[PDB]
Amino acid sequence: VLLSGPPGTGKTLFARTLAKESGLPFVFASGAEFTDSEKSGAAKINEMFSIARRNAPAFVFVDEIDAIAGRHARKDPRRRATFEALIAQLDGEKEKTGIDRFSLRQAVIFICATNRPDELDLEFVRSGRIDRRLYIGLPDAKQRVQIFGVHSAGKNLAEDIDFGKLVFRTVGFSGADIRNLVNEAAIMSVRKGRSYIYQQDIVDVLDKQLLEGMGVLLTEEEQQKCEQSVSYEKKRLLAV
Amino acid sequence: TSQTDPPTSIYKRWFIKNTQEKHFELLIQRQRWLRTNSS
Amino acid sequence: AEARVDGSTGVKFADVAGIDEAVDELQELVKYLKNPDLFDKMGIKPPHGVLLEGPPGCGKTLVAKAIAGEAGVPFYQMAGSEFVEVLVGVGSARIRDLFKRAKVNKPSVIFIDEIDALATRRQGINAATQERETTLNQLLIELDGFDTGKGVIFLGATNRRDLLDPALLRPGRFDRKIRVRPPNAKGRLDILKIHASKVKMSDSVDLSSYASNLPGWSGAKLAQLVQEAALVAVRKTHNSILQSDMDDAVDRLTVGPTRIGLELGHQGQCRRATTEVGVAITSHLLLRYENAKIERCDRVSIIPRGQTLSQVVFHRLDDESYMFGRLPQLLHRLQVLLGGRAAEEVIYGSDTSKASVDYLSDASWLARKILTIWNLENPMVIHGEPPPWRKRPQFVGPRLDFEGSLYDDYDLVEPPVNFNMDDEVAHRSEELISQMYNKTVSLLRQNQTALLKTVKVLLNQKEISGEAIDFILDHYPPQTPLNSLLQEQNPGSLPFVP
Amino acid sequence: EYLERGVDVKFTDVAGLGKIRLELEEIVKFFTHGEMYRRRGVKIPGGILLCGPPGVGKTLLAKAVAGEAGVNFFSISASQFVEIYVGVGASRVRALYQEARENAPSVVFIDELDAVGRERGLIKGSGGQERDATLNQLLVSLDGFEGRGEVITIASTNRPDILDPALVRPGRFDRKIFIPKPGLIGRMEILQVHARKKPMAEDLDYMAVASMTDGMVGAELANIVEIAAINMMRDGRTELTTDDLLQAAQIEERGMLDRKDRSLETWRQVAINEAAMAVVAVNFPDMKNIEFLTINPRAGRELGYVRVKMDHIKFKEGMLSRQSILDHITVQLAPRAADELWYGEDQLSTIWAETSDNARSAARSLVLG
Amino acid sequence: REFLVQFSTLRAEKRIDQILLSLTHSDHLSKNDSGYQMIEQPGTIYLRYLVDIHKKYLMNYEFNTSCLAERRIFLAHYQTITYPSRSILVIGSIGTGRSYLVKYLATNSYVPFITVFLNKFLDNKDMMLEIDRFYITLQFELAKAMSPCIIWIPNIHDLSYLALGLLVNSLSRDCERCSTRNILVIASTHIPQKVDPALIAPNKLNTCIKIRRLLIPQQRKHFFTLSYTRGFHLEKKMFHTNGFESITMGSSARDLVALTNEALSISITQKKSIIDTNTIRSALHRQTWDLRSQVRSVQDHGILFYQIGRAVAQNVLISNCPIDPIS
Amino acid sequence: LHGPPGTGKTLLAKAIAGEAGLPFFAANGTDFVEMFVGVAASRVKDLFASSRSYAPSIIFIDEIDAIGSKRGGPDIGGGGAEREQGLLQILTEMDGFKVTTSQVLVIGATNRLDILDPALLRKGRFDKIIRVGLPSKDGRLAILKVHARNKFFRSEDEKEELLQEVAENTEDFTGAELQNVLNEAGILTARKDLDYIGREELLEALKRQKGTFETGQEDSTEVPEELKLRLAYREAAVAVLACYLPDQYRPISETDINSIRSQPNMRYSETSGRVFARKSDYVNSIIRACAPRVVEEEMFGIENLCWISAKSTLEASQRAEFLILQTGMTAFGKAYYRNQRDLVPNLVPKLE
Amino acid sequence: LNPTVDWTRETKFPHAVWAAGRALITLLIPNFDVVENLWLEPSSWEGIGCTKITKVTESRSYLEKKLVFCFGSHIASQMLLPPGDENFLSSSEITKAQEIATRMVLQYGWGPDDSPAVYYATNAVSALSMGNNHEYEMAGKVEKIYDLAYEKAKGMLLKNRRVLEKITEELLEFEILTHKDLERIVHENGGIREKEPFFLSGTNYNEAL
């Protein structure tokens, strides 16, 4: 099973509720530390699949497979050994693995995911090795409102705060981005001495991020003097 | 870019052969574009 | 590092030949080597390094060995390829060891054969390269730190100056740069005299003709000439080197060995014979009538040798006439180039073949060279064009090296802008080639009897000589009927005995 | 390891200095009068960079300033930093700067920074990553963290455009001094200092030798000194004169003079070619002062040559008139003019094919210039 | 690590019942109008005959040299075999699938099937040469000890001098002696233009064989013969009519095995043994469609007409091309 | 942190270390990476364990580009494997930070961005990515007056006015530039034995720091009258055209003929505020572009043009093509064509 | 393993026409190579029809004969196949003709006027300056020689129409034909061969001495 989509969408939540509702052991690792060093290049994949087999039936879930099954895996022999070990453990064929293809110990589902689906090799996404592909995307306005409510439940909100009139300003935001936005509003709430967080704190946070986006870091006083520095007619043209 | 070292012998040229080379390629490319985009 | 410490190297300045300018320049080094005191009293800074640059087989190593032998100093020989290793730092250690062993017995000579192996230029077009750079750094440190008062002269022999780093060419490391030119006619003569004293020689061998007729041949190539002559005489069980065996070695090393019975059909040989005989007849006619500044035919053959199914041999003239190539000389040489197609067009009527295509390409390129590169005609042209095809100057086939070479522009090319004069240049070249083709076909068609008789005689004998071609030309005057040849009992019969 | 002994070179040992020498003694002042420098509140500029043509003796200037400063001198080749292994070069730079700081006060010299100061992102290989690591290490040990106020680095490069602008940042390399090619007086004094170790004469005029060899580096002047020792024993005279120097310069700028067999018409052709060049040159302003005229073949040129020394100020700056190029094209075409006017139109040779293309290239450069 | 797993592929010899069951095997459903008749594939018949001759020890008796009769019979038999190579190369990996035919022909071979890997001889980088030589001679001695056996060498193109020497001395020595002459050294790769000309001798790995892509009748035949071998009978409506020919795709090997497995899984989850049209359609839909969250449909009808018109045109006009479903 | 080189990132890190009052751990980028594998990871994990032991702590890593370099090619030498091992080890140590036990703050500093690998910048590892850019005129004034506390001047008012007037001409300069201007002025004053920083010392420091000189030779050259005349005529023609065609934002202020340049040596009084420029302004700029060629052709004739002054109508050609194509008040049309390829063969004769 | 098409006459008719036309144009050229066998292989990847031809310093006339021979399958498919059914079979030959003609114009100089102008060599990477408007002239020359070979092939192929039909139906009904069978067909049905000397244009032909 190949999961794909933008990062930070909660791809681990799908696997975790998979394990919870299915009631199985859940072998979980990360693909970054599999090209670790010379002490064990491809042996980690083999011991991973052996632990999975010894506790089979179960799931196998690996993070950032693009660091292993990337298009530059055939160049580096160290990458090639790991990719060959993974693609050999992906199938049966008793030789070189020493186990019957059809057995309880071979009832293992291999979950893999990345952030770049087109970066993977042509022979890894082939049917028989990777069958189903799930594409998880960014949420929409109502889910954004619910996430804003969820991540800001344990904070002292005012009465005028309403995220339904700022949904158009948060297009493409992930859950981590909304959490960062709430923390940002809290920080500029406590910076100005404010006890609560109104809507204007969120508006100011979004506006200051937008101002910083083009590389303008100015406090109020310097912004005011630089506005006063410009003449009147050449501001009158920008006004029209 | 006019061969800043002066030639002591008249046999040597006043300009390096590679001075005006990008303009030759530019003119050739423009003429070839005009020739190909007309037929 | 078994640097051979020989008290007598076995060769002196009498063993070198054809290197007169370089040995005359190195006589100063020999004078410094035998007694440096008069050098030291007046205050000379002797050359830190002398670089011998030249073609292989010219005996630069022999020159340095002769210098050491005449100077009576130990000679340290260890090639550049002996400084390359896999481990790092060993080559610099060998450099230091060789240098300090040289400083032990002062005066002494250090010689590095193929110095460009360690001194490859960092071209911008494993750990061995780092070893090369470290060895270069150690060598330049030892050279720059060499005080000139102790008289240790370091010699560097190289085959290519372009790949050698300019840091060594800086004064203070390689002060002297000597070129070792290939031996001249007198030089090859003297090398033949030296090498002929080792093998038994007959009085019928005239080495002057062999020295004159083998241009640019190195001393090692003359050595292999005399060695293969000895082996041919062994094969023939000859008691001494005859002139026939020497010429056999010549044709073995120049064009190649003769095959056994490998011949194509009777049509595959008539066309090549017609082409080569037509080229020879045009050359001889241009020599006879208009007194051209062109070469002379030696012999014409259709016997396959090496990878040439047929061959015509042309002598090489003196290089003093190879500098100011005038327009008439180029036009007659260009007529000689189309002589082959003239022969196919007159003998076969209108069915030519592919055997004369290369001469056509050469004529077409030299017409452009006359027009664009040299600008010999007098409409002025703004640019020259490089040759799309490049064929190297080579053996017995037409010389094509009258101006050093044919297919070498002297960096006289520029990219064109106007495309309307390019067609006028093409039309001018076509007009020149067509007019010249009609003139060469008209001159060759006037003598069909001599051409046909030479073709028949060469086909019967499989080889003809220049004197035989001249005899056929004299005995067959222009405007005689072909029936006179056709009534003979044997058209391919040569009554002339050389 | 990187410390050298016996640094006795001073400013008197080096010639062709000029106002740059003032900056040099300013460096000496930085090593001597720095107490009032920091009393006024001036941080000593650590980075001084000499840029110029090769062979001017930048390392010789480094030895001179180190000897006059009277401090420890470090002279490290930059080629040792780049290696097939990573991390070792950074440790080499760390040990270098640590032993420089321990040997304070001192001056450190690194030559040819173009090998390791290349801008990051120009080559795709492990050597590029090692070069980046070494550049980062030297950058940190130069300006990264506090701890250096006494160690001063001097560097010698040839191409200043290749260097990383991070290195060119003030506080790392802020003093940039260009060492130009020696002029007239500079060549005079370089010849004098390189010739002080040999017995010379009192009638020896270096003015003609300096004017003969124009536009050359100090290494070439040392070479002229080196060809002032080997060639007088052929005749065996008493004392060195200026004639030998003039002949040595003539040999060096063109090649050795070799004589070969030659016919009369070949000599006539080379003579009429050189006559064409000189005669068309003398009537033009920019090429009027023809000083030499010979048909003797030299190394690489079987032709003769005509020697002129025009003004070399307008040529470099670009203030040459339009008529100044229409005259030169005529000069290049005049060999073909003499050939056509003497041997006829039908007997044009190929000896002028090297000037006939220079004329057309100059015309092409003029029309689109 | 490979030597242990290739040494234990047969720790005990095949039982008498197993050998007797294998020795009397049959044709198994070639002559059907739905799947894989005689004339459809000649190469697999030749490989079947070769492995059958290997099974009955009919290769060690290389010739008879008798008076007239047995010689004539042997000449006729050698004619019928091709239109006795002890080693056969197959070069057909231009499309997909390598083992899908080798194990398909070796499942009824009853001899030990050893697949040595050449990539183990590359990753070992005077001690390496000795270890590699001992390893390869142990592999060859084990292969001899497992006689009769079939050796498969995939991806020859990875081949280095020591393995070349081993192979050349093995194919120069073990073909005129070493009594078990029936040792097949079958091998497959995907690039035939890079092999050296010294390995294509008549006595050394001859008779190259090609494998091409799968056409639609061959796809139907392979699907039917893969579904029937598991007790699943194809329903007599899609191969009996033009039903599933117009919807089938995946014109390559290893694309029908996965489709067959998915269809069999779908029928098993229904506790059925027959495959209808709907099962095949649902199996095809689960392979060339991506599952997706945050589902949204087209909000502008007018691209629907584009798809409708293109599908109608592709249906009526080009009667030999598939139609992907419209949504 | 990142930004322009020498903008004060190291100064900001030192300020953080000084004013934090927390255990500060200064590190280096290329310190960890070597040829032998495992050294970098062991060093970094020892550092991380030390910071966890002394929580709260401020770990600062200078020049993360040494180990944070993105894979941009095959690492044949094998040092890239060590770099990636160290990088992923740093990522694992960063992700091992539980919020209830590890109050360790990571402070990065880099001079490059495009060579970094986009996994450190991901969530949970580097949330804040700030950039200290070039300071404004007030920021430039603040940094020069901070750098001029120990710097001795004639008087406080004179120091302030000199600092303000050098602040008005130090645009596009970072903190290192202003600090080096002050440092070089101090060098000049100490060399000239003047106890206070004069105005001409600031002028010479500015002249050095913008790199006006490039020859770097002994400036003693006898200039011919034919050159002084050409420069004077070029400058006078520029003055006449500028006075006759008045530019509302760049009046001519100073004029010298002491230097040889491709462009005239004129000086203009720069006034910011070019929001608008009419078609007449473009025409006037085109006219002012081709002054030296016209003046040299008028007084000295066609056959006396320089190679430089004849290369002046080319800039007029570029400006006129800019006016026709990329401004859109001509009759060529009302579109914006970028000269490279959106010029269909119909509009080429019209443009010409 | 499998043929891509069934053994019906509507499929084998274009291939039979192709092979018969090639064999006939091989037969009618004098002193040319000899066609030996024709058959329709059901499982050949090159095509159903297969033709065996054995060859008999190639002169100008041999190259002219090859160039005019390179049109036979195309012209045979032009008279024989009905409209509405065309072929992409002769294309691999026609570009060969597009290769052959230029070789006498650029390389060997056997142009329309027997000009020794040579602009291409065996080891050349490009051609000469070639002009800008001069390319149209040689392009016209190349189209002229190509059309001249095409019209020669058409003239000497349309005069053996019934012989070609006979060869096609014998190939369709027997599936094997030999050189003797082709000789019998061209003898009984009245095949007319060409005669020496063979030239594409007789306006400049000469006779050897």
Q: With an 8 Å Cβ cutoff, are D351 and C323 in contact?
A: yes
Q: Is D126 left (phi over 0), alpha (psi -120 to 50) or beta?
A: alpha
To one decimal, the resolution in angstroms is 3.3
Rounded Cα distance, G9 and B23, in Å: 65
Minimal Cβ distance to E293: which of A81, A126, A136: A136
Name residue D76's beta-bridge partners: D110
Paired tokens of F320:
């006129």
Annotated binding site of D for ATP: 52-59
Long-range contacts of C93-96 (CB under 8 A, 24+ apart): C94/C1, C95/C135, C95/C138, C95/C139, C95/C142, C96/C138, C96/C142
Question: Do E88 and E210 touch, CB atoms closer than 8 A?
Answer: no
Q: With an 8 Å Cβ cutoff, are F275 and A72 in contact?
A: no
Backbone angles phi, psi at G45, to 5 degrees: -75, -25
Rounded Cα distance, D156 and D48, in Å: 9
H-state helical runs in B1-39: 22-36
Burial class (CB in 10 A: 0-12, 13-18, 19+), E133: middle
Give the containing element (helix H, strand E) for C431.
helix C420-445
Question: Do D78 and D205 touch, CB atoms closer than 8 A?
Answer: no
- State which approach was used to obtain the coordinates: cryo-EM
| 3 state SS of E39 | coil
Rounded Cα distance, B39 and C360, in Å: 34
Burial class (CB in 10 A: 0-12, 13-18, 19+), A80: middle
Paired tokens of C309:
């199914």
Q: With an 8 Å Cβ cutoff, are F345 and B38 in contact?
A: yes
* Buried-state track A26-47, b at ≥16 Cβ within 10 A, e below 16: bbbeebbebbbeeeebbebbbe
Rounded Cα distance, D116 and D135, in Å: 7
Touching F: D residues 146-175, CB under 8 Å: 146, 165-166, 169-172, 174
Rounded Cα distance, C403 and D343, in Å: 20
The distance of B30 to chain D (nearest Cα, Å) reads: 15
CA A20 to chain centre: 20
Peptide bond into F135 cis (omega under 30): no
CA distances to F260, F264, F289 from F256, rounded to whole Å, are 10, 9, 19
C-chain CB neighbours of B18 within 8 Å are none
Contact partners, residue F92, CB within 8 Å, separation at least 6: A32, A33
Name residue D290's beta-bridge partners: D308
Rounded Cα distance, E248 and E242, in Å: 11
Angle at CA of residue F301, ends F297 and F306, nearest 5°:
65
Task: Work out the number of other CB atoms within 10 angstroms of the CB of residue E92.
Answer: 20
DSSP 8-state assignment for residue E154: E
CA distances to C21, C260, C336, D262, G149 from C24, rounded to whole Å, are 5, 50, 43, 22, 71
CA distances to A172, A179, A207 from A203, rounded to whole Å, are 17, 15, 6
Residue carrying the six token digits 């406080």? F156
Peptide bond into G197 cis (omega under 30): yes
Rounded Cα distance, E2 and E135, in Å: 10
Q: Which residue of F has its CA nearest to A75?
A: F74
Peptide bond into C387 cis (omega under 30): no
In E, what residues contact G, Cβ < 8 A?
40-44, 212, 215, 217-218
Instruction: Give chain G as a DSSP string.
Output: ---SS---HHHHHHHHHHHHHHHHHHHHSTT--EEEEEEE-TT-SS-SEEEEEE-----HHHHHHHHHHTTHHHHHHHHHSPTT---SSTHHHHHHHHHHHHIIIIIS---TT--------TT-SS-----SSHHHHHHHHHHHHHHHHHHHHHHHHGGGHHHHHHHHHHHHHHSEEEHHHHHHHHHHTT-----SSP-S-TTS-----
Rounded Cα distance, F213 and F259, in Å: 10
Sign of CA dihedral C141, C142, C146, C151: negative
Minimal Cβ distance to D177: which of F33, F195, F216: F216
H-state helical runs in F192-278: 199-209, 225-244
Rounded Cα distance, C45 and C147, in Å: 9
Give the containing element (helix H, strand E) for E316.
helix E304-316
Q: Please state at what angle helix C448-461 crosses helix C466-475, rounded to 10 degrees.
A: 140
D-chain CB neighbours of C376 within 8 Å are 348, 350
Name residue C154's beta-bridge partners: C49, C110
Name residue E114's beta-bridge partners: E151
Minimal Cβ distance to E5: which of A77, A96, A128: A96
Instruction: Give D316-367 as a DSSP string.
Output: HHT---HHHHHHHHHHHHHHHHHHHHHH-STT--SSSTTTHHHHHHHHHHHH
D-chain CB neighbours of B4 within 8 Å are 315-316
Name residue G34's beta-bridge partners: G54
* Buried-state track D187-210, b at ≥16 Cβ within 10 A, e below 16: bbbbbebbbeeeebeeebebeebb
Helix then strand count (H, E) for chain A reads: 8, 5
Whether chains B and C touch (3+ CB pairs under 8 A) is answered by yes
Q: Please state at what angle helix F39-53 crosses helix F79-95, rounded to 10 degrees.
A: 20
| 3 state SS of E310 | helix
Instruction: Give A11-63 as a DSSP string.
Output: HHHHHHHHHHHHT--EEEEESGGGS--SS-SSHHHHHHHHHHHHT-SEEEEEE
| Residue from C274, C351, C372 whose CB has the most chain G CBs within 10 Å, to mutate | C351
Question: Do F318 and F339 touch, CB atoms closer than 8 A?
Answer: no
Instruction: Give C51-120 as a DSSP string.
Output: EEE--TTS-HHHHHHHHHHHHT--EEE--GGGG--SSSSHHHHHHHHHHHHHHHSSSEEEEEESGGGT-B
Residue carrying the six token digits 């220079």? D358
CA torsion, ordered C286, C292, C294, C297, to nearest 10 deg: 40
Question: Do A91 and A129 touch, CB atoms closer than 8 A?
Answer: yes
Q: Please state at what angle helix G179-188 crosses helix G9-28, rounded to 10 degrees.
A: 80
CA torsion, ordered F29, F30, F36, F39, to nearest 10 deg: -40
- What is the bridge-based pairing of β-strands A58-63 and C297-301? unpaired
Q: With an 8 Å Cβ cutoff, are C376 and D348 in contact?
A: yes
What letter represents residue D16's amino acid?
G
Annotated binding site of D: 52-59
Rounded Cα distance, F92 and F84, in Å: 12
CA distances to D40, F156, F202 from F159, rounded to whole Å, are 15, 5, 11
Backbone angles phi, psi at C384, to 5 degrees: -110, 160
Q: With an 8 Å Cβ cutoff, are G117 and C338 in contact?
A: no
Paired tokens of E280:
């095949």
Paired tokens of F331:
């009759």
Angle at CA of residue E307, ends E306 and E312, nearest 5°:
105
CA distances to A31, B3, C166, D66 from D63, rounded to whole Å, are 56, 34, 24, 5
CA torsion, ordered C396, C400, C401, C403, to nearest 10 deg: 160
Question: Do F297 and F305 touch, CB atoms closer than 8 A?
Answer: yes
Rounded Cα distance, C81 and E37, in Å: 69
Backbone angles phi, psi at C158, to 5 degrees: -135, 155
| Complete edge-to-edge strand list for the sheet that includes strand F104-109 | F24-28, F57-62, F104-109
Residue carrying the six token digits 């006898």? F222
Taking the Cβ of residue C370 and every Cβ of chain G, the question of whether any pair is shorter than 8 Å is answered with no
Task: Work out the number of other CB atoms within 10 angstroms of the CB of residue F349.
Answer: 7
Question: Do A31 and A42 touch, CB atoms closer than 8 A?
Answer: no
